[PDB]
Structures are given as structure tokens and as C-alpha cells.
RNA sequence: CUGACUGGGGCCUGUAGAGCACUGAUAGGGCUAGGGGGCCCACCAGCCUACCAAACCCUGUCAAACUCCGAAGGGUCCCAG
RNA sequence: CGCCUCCUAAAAGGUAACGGAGGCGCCCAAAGGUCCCCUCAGGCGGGACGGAAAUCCGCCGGAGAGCGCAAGGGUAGAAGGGGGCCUGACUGCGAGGCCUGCAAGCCGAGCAGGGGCGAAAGCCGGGCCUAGUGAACCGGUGGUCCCGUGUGGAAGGGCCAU
RNA sequence: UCCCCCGUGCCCAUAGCGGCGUGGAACCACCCGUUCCCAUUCCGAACACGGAAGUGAAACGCGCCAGCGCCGAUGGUACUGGGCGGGCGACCGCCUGGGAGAGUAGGUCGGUGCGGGGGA
């Protein structure tokens, strides 16, 4: 990692909880990562948000 | 009077764990390899690190097909 | 002298001088041959003497040939320093010669000078040698 | 030295070899069509069907459906149910899609 | 060809300065050129 | 396929004369024209003028088709070049637009050549084929002095089924290639 | 009875040794980009290299980190002792 | 001084020296999963500028190409290059083995939920692989709603992921 | 159960390159065309689709050619598991077990397993 390649938390949008954490390069991807992922709290697929760790 | 050399890694135990004729089981690693020196045949898989393994109970088999390479198989019983 | 202007790596390990010669046992170039009879490490400076001191016999004319090369570097630590602290430093490149190897060959000169010129070269080596005429056994290969 | 034909057919066959299902060999010529399902593990062609033998006449696109019904009917007589469809080196479309529909509509589970 | 992204070809009349009528198929039907092979010095001997 | 002057003149004028002279034993035995590829070697488009489409549409009007992109093979030092850089263009010419571009080239382009001294008979591919190149596109009919923004040329390569460069030479001379030697 | 040891079959190997097809290294030669030198010209070329030499060709040598080849062994499984 | 690659290292696996050589502490939103398609380096002929070598054609051309980065192994019958749809850079697990003194690191079919793509067969628990790492202790953050010193809350912990 | 073609595998050049010669009734290929489905980082070259006038030229199939390539004995040797002598040593020998590499003769211009439709 680096100050640019940062790890962050992935927050499921419909359960208000964070389920994951991955890598992204803020120079190549400064946008907020929003990607599908499974949420056991909702028991179904949900789109996930980029939230600061 | 120093030595800029003197650095090394540890060996990874590369080779054939079960030779042809040995008793194997599902999950028993067959050959630890880097790259494709051996290629999988019947009931033999390949891992991300190129390691091979048997899928069923049977007998190990080594059959060299020349330009296709050496192949490993498992004989059910 | 004779030494590589480019190599892959700097130093080479010593190895072992066991066994007979790989090849070059048959006269391949000239009318007469000088073949060393003992295994040892030979230096390109001694071989340099074998070239210069031998052209100094004819003073002009003739043709002298070379059958070997110093492809093996030789290293030595500085003086008055202890063991360890890396391998020694190279002071020159040495040649690997095995028993029965035809080291040199002479052509374009008479029999008398073919024996006499290779004689001094025989005395310039730590190992004994022999002068053999290009023989019917040689060209068969 | 090989060609893109070899490099292509070899690939679409190497993928089908590893699955284990029955492999339907598809060789296509200018005039007629040919189809055969083979078990390569024991290395013997079991059954085959072709438009040249079936004496078909017109458009190849609708010709493939009939030969698919023929091969699928023979396999239905033998009791064959599941099969993997090899598309050969050619692009999967049109006539090969309608022959594949011949085997699908013929009852084979794929 | 690729329809839509390529220049379409139609019967084209190309009239040179010498008078030789050129019946061809170009991007522009009506074309006028200044010098052709019929009036070219090196082409004509 | 739309019939054209060079097409008719080959089968009715060029084909019978080749049949007489060389006496071919089959109809496919006679030399056939395979394909005519065009390579615009702009190059300088890597530099200040990054886009060469202003010269690409030129070939779109000349050949009637848009030339493809050709990207660099690997990073190259002295040309200030890197891998995958579009410094050239390429367009393949075939069934009918090839005959069209042939009539335009021979009848309009080759005449307009500045101080034309003739063709070089030694530039054959050796297998019965030929390649060449042009300096100024104003020579072609489809290009005038109005819309030309910069100076650029081309490299026209052709392929043939003929085997001997002698048969190829008689083919070109019979089709109207004015060799100077 | 499975143990050390060994017999019969099966499988794994890249060193001794050998070898130059790959990576390097090489002496001489042929051939030949190419420079240097002497002629021949600033106006351009044609001419010759008892010259260092690319590539390729011939001959002969080098290797722990070179391997087109290659054991004895060693390894390990399977019956009997 | 931890880690990776090659040699010694004596053809299984393992083997030290202040020995002979080099590299890692990053980087990737596609360089990932699926599906379809493509085939080099180099050499020979021609070709604006145009080049030893930019870009194309022809003919010869099993890998010397390129696979982020050292190096090895591997590989064009791809894992390598051009585009499409995509999130399996999954949740809950896990037969058995590898490695092995412990802790540990590596492989992994397969079953269930929920999903991507293909016509299908199938394939997807990140990357061609081996380096790109940190054990306990402490606290935070977000959730969980397990505990609550009579009791009902609450404080603070616990669990989970981080 | 015999011969010619075309699908699909095996061994993985004894099978390749290279040239000599040839195959179209069936059959495949190139071929005939591009409205149409499909298609070129351009091109109906490829990819794809509808057809049947022409052709074995190319490719492919099948013969020959040992030029190159490929495979390559035997005989000896290198080397070595294991048992010994010598040399101040760099190292050298014989006893028994294994046995190369290369190289010399010589061999190969394939053989083979099923499914189709044709021929005796
Ligand atoms: Mg940091
Ligand atoms: Mg940093
Ligand atoms: Mg900083
Ligand atoms: Mg900071
Ligand atoms: Mg000091
Ligand atoms: Mg250093
Ligand atoms: Mg260490
Ligand atoms: Mg360790
Ligand atoms: Mg065990
Ligand atoms: Mg076997
Ligand atoms: Mg075998
Ligand atoms: Mg072999
Ligand atoms: Mg040694
Ligand atoms: Mg040695
Ligand atoms: Mg020898
Ligand atoms: Mg000192
Ligand atoms: Mg001192
Ligand atoms: Mg004499
Ligand atoms: Mg005498
Ligand atoms: Mg005499
Ligand atoms: Mg000889
Ligand atoms: Mg500039
Ligand atoms: Mg720049
Ligand atoms: Mg750049
Ligand atoms: Mg027992
Ligand atoms: Mg024990
Ligand atoms: Mg033991
Ligand atoms: Mg035996
Ligand atoms: Mg190794
Ligand atoms: Mg050695
Ligand atoms: Mg050689
Ligand atoms: Mg290598
Ligand atoms: Mg010269
Ligand atoms: Mg000359
Ligand atoms: Mg010279
Ligand atoms: Mg040679
Ligand atoms: Mg051999
Ligand atoms: Mg044991
Ligand atoms: Mg063990
Ligand atoms: Mg047992
Ligand atoms: Mg240390
Ligand atoms: Mg450690
Ligand atoms: Mg080892
Ligand atoms: Mg151990
Ligand atoms: Mg032990
Ligand atoms: Mg110590
Ligand atoms: Mg370093
Ligand atoms: Mg050539
Ligand atoms: Mg310049
Ligand atoms: Mg190869
Ligand atoms: Mg091959
Ligand atoms: Mg290979
Ligand atoms: Mg090369
Ligand atoms: Mg690399
Ligand atoms: Mg390799
Ligand atoms: Mg969970
Ligand atoms: Mg169980
Ligand atoms: Mg165990
Ligand atoms: Mg471990
Ligand atoms: Mg233990
Ligand atoms: Mg909290
Ligand atoms: Mg409450
Ligand atoms: Mg709380
Ligand atoms: Mg807390
Ligand atoms: Mg019968
Ligand atoms: Mg009968
Ligand atoms: Mg066949
Ligand atoms: Mg082969
Ligand atoms: Mg053949
Ligand atoms: Mg010849
Ligand atoms: Mg003859
Ligand atoms: Mg002849
Ligand atoms: Mg008839
Ligand atoms: Mg073509
Ligand atoms: Mg085709
Ligand atoms: Mg129609
Ligand atoms: Mg016969
Ligand atoms: Mg001859
Ligand atoms: Mg023993
Ligand atoms: Mg004795
Ligand atoms: Mg005694
Ligand atoms: Mg002793
Ligand atoms: Mg003594
Ligand atoms: Mg002593
Ligand atoms: Mg003796
Ligand atoms: Mg024994
Ligand atoms: Mg043949
Ligand atoms: Mg042949
Ligand atoms: Mg019959
Ligand atoms: Mg008959
Ligand atoms: Zn959710
Ligand atoms: Zn005119």
C-alpha cells in the first residue's frame, strides 16, 4: 500500500453496516467505490459504498 | 572488507510427493512444481502455485507423451 | 595478453583437475605438436612467454598456433589480512590444461626448428611436455 | 508450423475435453454438414449423422435442424441424454446454431 | 463493408482537362481533374 | 461486382496476350491479383500533431475506405517512440475499390508525378509481386491543393499469384505500368 | 513381523562424465555490413585493403551459476526374505 | 540481521562460511471473472519525409517475442494481445494432504445460501507462479444486541469485522 | 472380410523440410456471389451467409526423391555404486557390478484405433 494506494471499508447501503475492505488507488480511482456485494444482515445482494476506514 | 553477498531464501521442498504406484487420497498433493513441468491428466488438478493433487482414490500413473510432456493420472478401484 | 574483455561474472571457483582431457588430444592445425603431459593451472603470462620467446627463435617467418585459452579467472586475497571477508582479488586469468592435451602446434618451419622452438616452450612450463609430429592417428578424426 | 485454424479448433476442443460430458464433433464443408458424438476417454466414435447421408437439398440453415433431429433421435434410441456441444473452429452462429438447436430441440439436455 | 462509418461509393463521372470522360465509382460523383493520362507527356510517348 | 475499365481490359486484353505469350495450361494458372495494401507511414504524428485523422480521411476519400490504426511494436529510443504508439496507418484494398483505385492511380496519379522519369524495374518483391510509395498526395485525383493541411505520402504494396518476376513484369507492362528501362 | 539390510518390478532426478542446439566464452580461416589507411574528388563517385572486424560458414578448444544428451547411485511405493 | 531468485548443494528431499550474483518492503478498478477473436522476436524484397531500427505487405521464420518489476521455472494447443458483459479480489464451510519442532506458510476438489457469464459444457474464493511482510499485549472505529454486582436502565466490557 | 476419400484419436519427425509426379464421376477445396443473418481496431483476405457457371493452377489427398533434418546400432572408452593398492602431492592403477555421451555402419519420404458415404 501507500498514501495513494489506500485501504477502505465497504459499507452496504441498505443495512447501514460495513461488510468488506479492499484496495484502490486514489490517483487512478479517486471516485467513491460502489460495488455489488453480499450482505448477510439483509440476506441478499446489495450495492456497497466507499467509506473511510 | 565487507560482503555484499550472503543472502538467500529457504527451499520449498519441490518434487514428487507420491510416485507412481503409491496410495493416494482426495486432497493428497501429488507433485509440488513451479510452472508446468508436469501436466495433469485423469483425476489430477492444478493449483495456483502449479501444485498438483489427486481427486479420487486410486493408483498414481506417470505417462510421458513426448511433445505433450509427462502426465500424471489416478486409477480408481 | 590473452584474456576476455567481457565476461558474465567476475570470479570462478577452482574445481578439480581430475580425469583425462576432454578433447584436443589429436593434432589439428600444424605440422608438429607440443602436448603437455601433466595436469595443472597455466597462466596467460606463461603462455605469453611461450608465444614471444618462441617467435624470438625464428626471428622472422614460420607460423605458430595456439590450442588453448585462459577462460578461468584466478583470485587472491591481499597480503597480511585474515581469512574470511569475501573471496580474494583477481591478479590475472589462468588457463586450464589437462594431460594429453595438445597445447600448441607449429607449421611453416623445418623439423630441427620445430623441435628446438618447442623445446624452450617446454622449459617455460612447470609441467613436462612432448613434441609429436602430426601423425596418421591425428587426421583420422 | 500451424495456422489459426489449428490454433482455434485445438482450443475449442481442449476446453471441451476437460469437462467430461459427451463431445459433439462438428465438421463443416461447403456442400454438406456432418455431426458425431464421441467419447474420447475410450477413443471411439459412437454415432454419427450427416446431411450428405440424409439426402438434404436446400438452405443449410434449415438443413441443420433436420440432421439435428436425426442424430438426437438416434441418441434418444440409445438412451443418451446429456451432451456437450463443440462448435469447432468456426464461429458459433447460423447453421451451427440451428444444428445445435437440432440437438437441443431433439431432447438432449444442454 | 462497415455500413455507416465508411464512405459510400456511387457511379462517378470524372472529367479531366483534356476531355477524356472517366466512368468510375468515387466518393464524389461529379469530379473535375486538371491533368490525366490521356494528356500526360510521359504517358503519351 | 461493378464492371470497370481495367477489369474488362484485363480479361479481354491482358489475359489473352498472357495466354498467347506464356501459354498457361489452366485458367487459375494465370497470374491473379491478390490484394493491395496501403501503408501511410506518417510517423511524425507521435510528435506535436498527435492525431493523423486529417490525413486518414484523405485515404477515406482516395480509396473509399477508412485506414486502420497501426501501433508501434515496442519502445524505440532514437525515434522518441514507445510501444503501441499509432505512428502509421494501413488499409487493405480488394474486390472492387481495388480496381477503382487502380484506374485512379494509373490514369490520374502516375501522370501528375512531378518530373516523372518512369518506373524502376528492379523494385519487384522477387516472388512476382511489387511494392512502391508516393511522396505528395496532391498527385492523386481525390486530393487537391485546398484541403491538404500538411505534406504526407504513402507506401503501396501489392500481392500477386504470379511466380516469376518476368511474368510479373509482363503483367505490369501489359496493364500499363510505364517502366523507364 | 511391521525393523535395520537386500532381492524383482514401477516411478522421481540433472551432478560425475560428455556435449555447443540455447546463455556466455573462444584461436585461426572463409565470406562479408562496416569503419580506419592509401589512392582518387568538394562536385559525386569509381579503385585497393600483409587493417582492427558484425553477421553467417569451416576447423578446434571453455563453464559452479551453459545444457540438445546422460548414468552408476540415491530416493520412494508395491510382494517375498 | 526478516523475505525472494539462481549456484555451490555430492542427479530424491534437506545441507554452512564476513562465499560467487542479483532483488522485495511496491504496484493493479483492469493488469480481475466469463465469453468470442488474434499469433511473435528475428531474418529476406519493396516502400514520402524515414532513419541500423517507427509504421504495412510479401516470402522464411516452435519461441531467442512478450508475460508490471530481480531471477528461475513455465508458457503461442496461452498463462500471452483486441473488444463485450461483469464483481466469486464471495458468505457460511471444508474431504484430505503439503510443510513441519511449536507457532506457523502452501494446495485444495467438494456441499449449501446468494451470484457473474456461455448456446452449452462448464468456468469465477483475484493476479502465470515463488518475494511486495509482523506474533501477543493496548485502544479506536462500525456493527452485533451476549453480559449488566439486588433490581430497571446505564457505564464498561464481550462477539464480529476491522 | 478387400480398395479410394473424408471426419475423429493414438504413438509423439522412423512421422519434418525440401523437390519429382499426380488426384476431381463421388467427394473436399479453391471457386460463384454479398439483399439477407453474420463480419473486418480497413478490407466478404479472414468471419459469415445464399448459390452452382468454371477449375485441380494453388491448397489438400496420395506416390517417388536419403539433399537437409530426424531416429542410430554393435565394439571400445569416458564415468561410477561397492572392495583394494600406490603417490610428498596436482593425482594414478588393477579385482568385481553398471554403463554412457559422442562417433562409425546403418534405418526412416510413417504406422496406427473407431465412425461415415463410395468402390470389389
Ligand atoms: Mg508507508
Ligand atoms: Mg513508498
Ligand atoms: Mg509521502
Ligand atoms: Mg504521513
Ligand atoms: Mg578493514
Ligand atoms: Mg550490490
Ligand atoms: Mg539468512
Ligand atoms: Mg522457513
Ligand atoms: Mg504416506
Ligand atoms: Mg506406464
Ligand atoms: Mg514409456
Ligand atoms: Mg524423443
Ligand atoms: Mg567442478
Ligand atoms: Mg573442470
Ligand atoms: Mg573428442
Ligand atoms: Mg593492505
Ligand atoms: Mg595492515
Ligand atoms: Mg617436411
Ligand atoms: Mg630424420
Ligand atoms: Mg618425414
Ligand atoms: Mg574431420
Ligand atoms: Mg519536440
Ligand atoms: Mg513526451
Ligand atoms: Mg511515452
Ligand atoms: Mg515382510
Ligand atoms: Mg529407523
Ligand atoms: Mg532409514
Ligand atoms: Mg532390472
Ligand atoms: Mg533446477
Ligand atoms: Mg562439469
Ligand atoms: Mg556445433
Ligand atoms: Mg535457459
Ligand atoms: Mg568493402
Ligand atoms: Mg573487391
Ligand atoms: Mg584481416
Ligand atoms: Mg557449423
Ligand atoms: Mg542419442
Ligand atoms: Mg524410508
Ligand atoms: Mg517421507
Ligand atoms: Mg498396503
Ligand atoms: Mg548471517
Ligand atoms: Mg524467518
Ligand atoms: Mg539437488
Ligand atoms: Mg528436513
Ligand atoms: Mg535426516
Ligand atoms: Mg562462524
Ligand atoms: Mg540490494
Ligand atoms: Mg532471405
Ligand atoms: Mg537525420
Ligand atoms: Mg521450440
Ligand atoms: Mg509443434
Ligand atoms: Mg518449449
Ligand atoms: Mg538467433
Ligand atoms: Mg521477466
Ligand atoms: Mg525454458
Ligand atoms: Mg460471517
Ligand atoms: Mg466424509
Ligand atoms: Mg499424517
Ligand atoms: Mg513452513
Ligand atoms: Mg514430528
Ligand atoms: Mg463503540
Ligand atoms: Mg433499553
Ligand atoms: Mg456498547
Ligand atoms: Mg469498545
Ligand atoms: Mg461388412
Ligand atoms: Mg462380400
Ligand atoms: Mg483422414
Ligand atoms: Mg512434430
Ligand atoms: Mg503428411
Ligand atoms: Mg532442391
Ligand atoms: Mg530427373
Ligand atoms: Mg524439372
Ligand atoms: Mg464422364
Ligand atoms: Mg490472404
Ligand atoms: Mg474459407
Ligand atoms: Mg439471392
Ligand atoms: Mg500404394
Ligand atoms: Mg541432387
Ligand atoms: Mg547398493
Ligand atoms: Mg585385490
Ligand atoms: Mg603392502
Ligand atoms: Mg592412500
Ligand atoms: Mg606411502
Ligand atoms: Mg597428506
Ligand atoms: Mg599408470
Ligand atoms: Mg551392487
Ligand atoms: Mg507424405
Ligand atoms: Mg509431404
Ligand atoms: Mg457399396
Ligand atoms: Mg475394380
Ligand atoms: Zn445488505
Ligand atoms: Zn479526360
Domain ranges of chain C: 29-137
The chain C residue lying nearest B5, using CA atoms, is C86
Residue E8 among known ligand-binding residues: no
The three cell numbers locating residue C74: 584466478
The three cell numbers locating residue C118: 618447442
Among D16, D50, D17, D51, residue whose Cα is nearest residue D36 = D50
Compute the distance from residue F34 Cα to the ligand 74 centre, in Å: 7
Number of H helices, E strands in chain E: 0, 3
Residue E5 among known ligand-binding residues: no
Compute the distance from residue B13 Cα to the ligand 44 centre, in Å: 9
| Euclidean distance between CA atoms F143 and F140, whole angstroms | 6
Q: Which residue has the cell 498457361?
A: F24
Nucleotide with the nearest C1' to A44 CA: H114
The three cell numbers locating residue F64: 473509399
D85 touches strand H (CB under 7 A): yes
Angstrom CA distances, A44 to A12, A15, A36, A47, F93, stand at: 11, 11, 11, 10, 56
Split into its structural domains, chain F has a count of 1
| Euclidean distance between CA atoms C88 and E9, whole angstroms | 80
Q: F161 with F178: CB under 8 angstroms?
A: no
Q: How far is C7 from chain B (nearest CA, A)?
A: 19
Contact status of F5 with chain E (Cβ, < 8 Å): yes
Mapped onto helix, strand or coil, the DSSP state of residue C55 is helix
Interface test with F, best of E5, E36, E41 (most F CBs within 10 A): E36
F127 touches strand H (CB under 7 A): yes
In the 8-47 segment of chain A, residues within 7 Å (Cβ) of strand H are: 9, 16-25, 27-29, 33, 35-38, 40-41, 43-45
Q: How far is B8 from chain C (nearest CA, A)?
A: 16
The three cell numbers locating residue E17: 482537362
The three cell numbers locating residue D13: 476442443
| Euclidean distance between CA atoms D59 and A32, whole angstroms | 55
Among F144, F142, F62, F136, residue whose Cα is nearest residue F98 = F62
Q: Which domain holds residue F127?
A: 2-181
The three cell numbers locating residue C90: 583477481
- Where is D97: in which H helix or E strand? helix D95-105
| Euclidean distance between CA atoms C66 and C122, whole angstroms | 14
Give the CATH number of the domain where residue F98 resides. Answer: 3.30.1440.10
Bridge partners for A48 per DSSP: A12, A35
| Euclidean distance between CA atoms A38 and A45, whole angstroms | 4
Q: What is the resolution of this structure in A?
A: 4.0
In the 49-108 segment of chain F, residues within 7 Å (Cβ) of strand H are: 70-74, 76-81, 84-85, 87-90
Domain spanning C29-137: CATH 3.30.1330.120: no
Phi and psi, residue A25, nearest 5°: -95, 110
Angstrom CA distances, D82 to A21, C33, D17, D21, D108, stand at: 42, 80, 15, 7, 6
B29 touches strand G (CB under 7 A): no
| Euclidean distance between CA atoms D31 and D38, whole angstroms | 23
User: A11: exposed, middle or buried (C-beta count within 10 Å: 0-12, 13-18, 19+)?
Assistant: middle
Q: A7 with A22: CB under 8 angstroms?
A: yes
Q: Would you give the distance in Å from CA C110 to the centre of its chain?
A: 23
Amino acid at each position: 500500500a501507500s498514501e495513494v494506494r489506500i485501504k477502505l471499508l465497504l459499507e452496504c447501503t441498505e443495512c447501514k453496516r460495513r461488510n468488506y475492505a479492499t484496495e484502490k488507488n486514489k490517483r487512478n480511482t479517486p471516485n467513491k467505490l460502489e460495488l455489488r456485494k453480499y450482505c448477510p444482515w439483509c440476506r441478499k445482494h446489495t450495492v456497497h459504498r466507499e467509506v473511510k476506514i | 572488507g565487507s560482503t555484499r553477498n550472503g543472502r538467500d531464501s529457504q527451499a520449498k521442498r519441490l518434487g514428487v510427493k507420491r510416485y507412481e504406484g503409491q496410495v493416494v487420497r482426495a486432497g493428497n498433493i501429488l507433485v509440488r512444481q513451479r510452472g508446468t513441468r508436469f501436466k495433469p491428466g485423469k483425476n489430477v488438478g492444478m493449483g495456483r502455485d502449479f501444485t498438483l493433487f489427486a481427486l479420487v482414490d486410486g493408483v498414481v500413473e506417470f505417462q510421458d507423451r513426448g511433445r505433450l510432456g509427462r502426465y500424471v493420472h489416478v486409477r480408481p478401484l | 595478453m590473452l584474456m576476455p574483455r567481457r565476461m558474465k561474472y567476475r570470479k570462478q571457483q577452482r574445481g578439480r583437475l581430475k580425469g583425462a582431457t576432454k578433447g584436443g588430444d589429436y593434432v589439428a592445425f600444424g605440422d608438429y605438436g607440443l602436448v603437455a603431459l601433466e595436469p595443472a593451472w597455466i597462466t596467460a603470462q606463461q603462455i605469453e612467454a611461450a608465444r614471444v620467446a618462441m617467435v624470438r627463435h625464428f626471428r622472422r617467418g614460420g607460423k605458430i598456433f595456439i590450442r588453448i585459452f585462459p577462460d578461468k579467472p584466478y583470485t587472491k586475497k591481499p597480503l597480511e589480512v585474515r581469512m574470511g571477508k569475501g573471496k580474494g582479488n583477481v591478479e590475472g586469468y589462468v588457463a586450464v590444461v589437462k594431460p594429453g592435451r595438445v597445447m600448441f602446434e607449429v607449421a611453416g618451419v623445418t623439423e630441427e626448428q620445430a623441435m628446438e622452438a618447442l623445446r624452450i616452450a617446454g622449459h617455460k612450463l612447470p609441467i613436462k611436455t612432448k613434441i609429436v609430429r602430426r601423425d596418421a592417428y591425428d587426421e583420422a578424426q | 508450423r500451424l495456422t489459426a485454424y489449428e490454433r482455434r479448433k485445438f482450443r475449442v476442443r481442449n476446453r471441451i475435453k476437460r469437462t467430461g460430458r459427451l463431445r459433439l464433433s462438428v465438421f463443416r464443408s461447403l456442400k454438406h454438414i456432418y455431426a458425431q458424438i464421441i467419447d474420447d476417454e475410450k477413443g471411439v466414435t459412437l454415432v454419427s449423422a450427416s446431411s450428405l447421408a440424409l439426402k438434404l437439398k436446400g438452405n443449410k440453415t434449415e438443413v441443420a435442424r433436420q440432421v439435428g433431429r436425426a442424430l438426437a433421435e438416434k441418441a434418444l434410441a440409445l438412451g443418451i441424454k446429456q451432451v456437450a456441444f463443440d462448435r469447432g473452429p468456426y464461429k458459433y452462429h447460423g447453421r451451427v446454431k440451428a444444428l445445435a438447436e437440432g440437438a437441443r430441440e431433439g431432447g438432449l439436455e444442454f | 463493408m462497415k455500413e455507416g462509418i465508411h464512405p459510400k461509393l456511387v457511379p462517378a463521372r470524372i472529367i479531366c482537362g483534356c476531355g477524356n470522360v472517366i466512368e468510375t465509382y468515387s466518393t464524389k460523383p461529379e469530379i473535375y481533374v486538371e491533368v490525366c493520362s490521356k494528356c500526360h507527356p510521359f504517358y503519351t510517348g | 461486382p461493378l464492371d470497370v475499365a481495367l477489369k474488362r481490359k484485363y480479361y479481354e486484353e491482358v489475359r489473352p496476350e498472357l495466354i498467347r505469350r506464356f501459354g498457361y495450361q489452366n485458367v487459375w494458372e494465370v497470374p491473379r491479383l491478390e490484394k493491395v495494401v496501403i501503408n501511410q507511414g506518417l510517423g511524425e504524428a507521435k510528435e506535436d500533431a498527435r492525431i493523423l485523422e486529417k490525413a486518414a480521411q484523405e485515404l477515406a476519400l482516395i480509396t473509399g475506405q477508412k485506414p486502420a490504426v497501426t501501433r508501434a511494436k515496442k519502445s524505440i529510443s532514437n525515434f522518441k517512440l514507445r510501444k503501441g504508439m499509432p505512428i502509421g496507418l494501413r488499409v487493405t484494398l480488394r474486390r472492387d475499390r481495388m480496381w477503382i483505385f487502380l484506374e485512379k492511380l494509373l490514369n490520374v496519379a502516375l501522370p501528375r508525378i512531378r518530373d516523372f522519369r518512369g518506373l524502376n524495374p528492379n523494385s519487384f518483391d522477387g516472388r512476382g509481386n511489387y511494392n512502391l510509395g508516393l511522396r505528395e498526395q496532391l498527385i492523386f485525383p481525390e486530393i487537391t491543393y485546398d484541403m491538404v493541411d500538411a505534406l504526407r505520402g504513402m507506401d503501396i504494396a501489392v500481392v500477386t499469384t504470379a511466380e516469376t518476376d518476368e511474368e510479373a513484369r509482363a503483367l505490369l507492362e501489359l496493364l500499363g505500368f510505364p517502366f523507364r528501362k
